[PDB]
Amino acid sequence: ATFEIVNRCSYTVWAAASKGDAALDAGGRQLNSGESWTINVEPGTNGGKIWARTDCYFDDSGSGICKTGDCGGLLRCKRFGRPPTTLAEFSLNQYGKDYIDISNIKGFNVPMNFSPTTRGCRGVRCAADIVGQCPAKLKAPGGGCNDACTVFQTSEYCCTTGKCGPTEYSRFFKRLCPDAFSYVLDKPTTVTCPGSSNYRVTFCPT
């Protein structure tokens, strides 16, 4: 499947793409404002994620640091990134279908649209000003708005037992972005698309 990753933000982002134990395609790249990066993701990929990283410094070896979404100090991510990270999540060719979503379970850093570029399903978006409105206890100094699990490390916020409810913090994310997951047991906002669809991820869509 092809994913076109577009930075419409006024600032540079460093895009990342991983399935947790491996890079997808090159795994990461700098995107200046307006740049597009096209990647190929192998059919059948389960548990893939794309995200943006902000305020990164990398040397000529591809080693450094980002203030949001850092993946072990590498330009080319092999592992998932450090919260806060707005997440585009996907599983492809799962019994004939593709499944896509946006999640705020690991917080929010950059606004995002995640849409098919082929026919047969709709896209999802979280484009509200979550960072500006972020509750004081969840604000990340590096930028972004952390989820409550990251901050407080409780069974309730992390849904450790598999029983948990919504919280004052999850409801904040949900009020601003109803079409994104706000906690682990949120009512699913996953979209089902035809198997082998292609997609576009747009940072700062509005």
CATH of the domain at 44: 2.60.110.10
| φ/ψ of residue 85, rounded to 5 | -145, 115
Q: How far is CA 92 from the centre of its chain?
A: 16
Range of the domain at 86: 1-206
What is the experimental method? X-ray
| φ/ψ of residue 169, rounded to 5 | -75, -45
> Which residue reads 């409105």 in tokens?
133
- As given in the structure block, the two tokens for residue 60 are 């000529």
Across the chain, where does the E strand assignment appear? 2-7, 13-18, 23-31, 36-40, 48-58, 64-68, 87-94, 97-103, 112-116, 124-126, 191-194, 199-203
Closest by CA to 130, choosing from 112, 148, 109, is: 109
Strand order in the sheet with 2-7: 36-40, 2-7, 199-203, 112-116, 124-126
Residue 144 Ramachandran class (φ > 0 left, ψ -120 to 50 alpha, else beta): left
DSSP states along 160-180? TTS-----HHHHHHHHH-TTS
Report the C-alpha gap between 172 and 191 in whole angstroms: 22
Beta bridge mates, 87? 103
Residue 11 near residue 38, CB atoms below 8 Å:
no
Residue 72 near residue 112, CB atoms below 8 Å:
no
Please state the domain count of the chain. 1
Q: What are the residues whose beta carbons fall under 8 Å from the beta carbon of 1, sequence distance 6 or more?
A: 40, 41, 43, 45, 92, 98, 196, 197, 198, 199
Report the C-alpha gap between 83 and 157 in whole angstroms: 15
